[PDB]
Amino acid sequence: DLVNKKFPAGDYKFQYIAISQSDADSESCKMPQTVEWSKLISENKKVIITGAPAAFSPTCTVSHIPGYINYLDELVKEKEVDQVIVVTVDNPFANQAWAKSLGVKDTTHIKFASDPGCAFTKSIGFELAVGDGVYWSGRWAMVVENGIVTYAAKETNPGTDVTVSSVESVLAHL
Amino acid sequence: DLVNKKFPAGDYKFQYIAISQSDADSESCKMPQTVEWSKLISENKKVIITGAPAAFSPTCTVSHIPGYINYLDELVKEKEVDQVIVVTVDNPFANQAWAKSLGVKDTTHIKFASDPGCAFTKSIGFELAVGDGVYWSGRWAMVVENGIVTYAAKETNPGTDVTVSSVESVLAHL
Structure with a gap:
């Protein structure tokens, strides 16, 4: 299990695009930033990380x-909480557009990350096989305090379940 | 080369979500349809296929x-033209959202496909290596008439170039 071991950052890196004051309700011309998981974790004492299968998942679905x-x-x-990181295997531009559609106006404390090719997500066993060697992220959530995983759980059916990955389940552990 | 040779469909398949009358300017609750490239090509005498690196590419870029x-x-x-298929490796929900943002109200003749894991795009050599064993589609375009490729070309620099993949270049070949 991951719980009570140091966050297994490895050399894994993620990408996201910032949203702020001006570009919150308009169109950004911004290229992705690349951030190593070890750097994010080193610089923030309290971090929530949560995986999602697909940017722009229909609103009718859970x-x-x-x-x-x-x-x-x-x-x-x-x-x-210093950071909330939402994780998909989707490209950073799509992740950002998705964040804005959901009402995010400021990424100071919440970032929508690309985990390219599901590499980090596969590494902690939280992936979702969709066919033919292709992997999306499952639905899951993790709390990292002072570089140490204090909570990690993935849904059994990401399609239908919001239980252990919910913000409420996570709140009970912070 | 591919030109003048039957469209190499293999067993490759793609996914897209439809847009129509009602859901054109609202939110769909629709799951992806899976379509075999061989079926698409068998059922349509004149097809344009064009690859793009990333759904929600910023409007400031080419x-x-x-x-x-x-x-x-x-x-x-x-x-x-019976069908225009826009191909990315992005999830079909993101592709659909992207299409709507671009002004597509009807997918009767234009569909935004996912080529999961870049499998079809890799097979014809039109992929774009982005790092660490991850592949996006390059920028390219193809004309298939009566099951036969009559034009196929990819940009040398998808980042900066719109030449051989442009609708204009393609128009000259229809």
């Missing part, structure tokens, strides 16, 4: 993501 | 895709 967005103020203000 | 959308009427009405 999701844990809106919950994290709704709860962000409490996470950052009352629960001292 | 793109051949808006051209195809602008020119769709002429393609379907005057040039008798």
Whole structure:
């Protein structure tokens, strides 16, 4: 298991695009930033990381993501969360557009990351096989405090289940 | 080369979501359809296929895709094109959202496909290596008439070049 071991960053890296004041409600001309998982974790004492199968998942379908967005103020203000990282294998531009559609106006404390080719997600066994050697991220959530995993769980059916990956389940562990 | 040779469909398949009358300007609750390349090609005498590196590429960067959308009427009405298929490795939900953002209200003659894991695109040598064993589609375009490739070309620099993949270059070949 991962729980109570150091966050297994390895050489894995993720990409995201920032959203801020001006470009929040308009179109950005911004190239992706690349960030090593070890750097993110080294620089932030309290980090939530949550995987999602697909950017632009239809709103009719079950999701844990809106919950994290709704709860962000409490996470950052009352629960001292430094970062919330939403993870998909989707390209960073699509992840960013998706974040904006969901109401994100500021990525200071929440970032929508690409895990290219599901490499990090496969490495911690939280992937979702979709066919033919292709992997999306499953639905899962992780808490990292001071470089140490204090909670990690993935859904049995990412299609239908929002339980252990929910912001509420996670709140109980922070 | 591919030109003048039967379209190499193999067992490759793609996924897309439809857009139509009602859901054109709203949110669909629709799952992806899977379509075999051989079926698409068997059922349509004149097909254009064009690869793009990334759904939601920023508007500030070069793109051949808006051209195809602008020119769709002429393609379907005057040039008798049955299908225009835009190909990315991105998930079909993201591809659909992308299409709508670009002004597509009807997928009768234009579909935004996922080529999962870049498998079809790799097979014809039109892929774009982005690092660490991960492949996006390059920028390219192909004309298939009566099951036979009559044009196929990819950009040397998909980042900066819209030449051989442009709707204009393709128009000259229909």
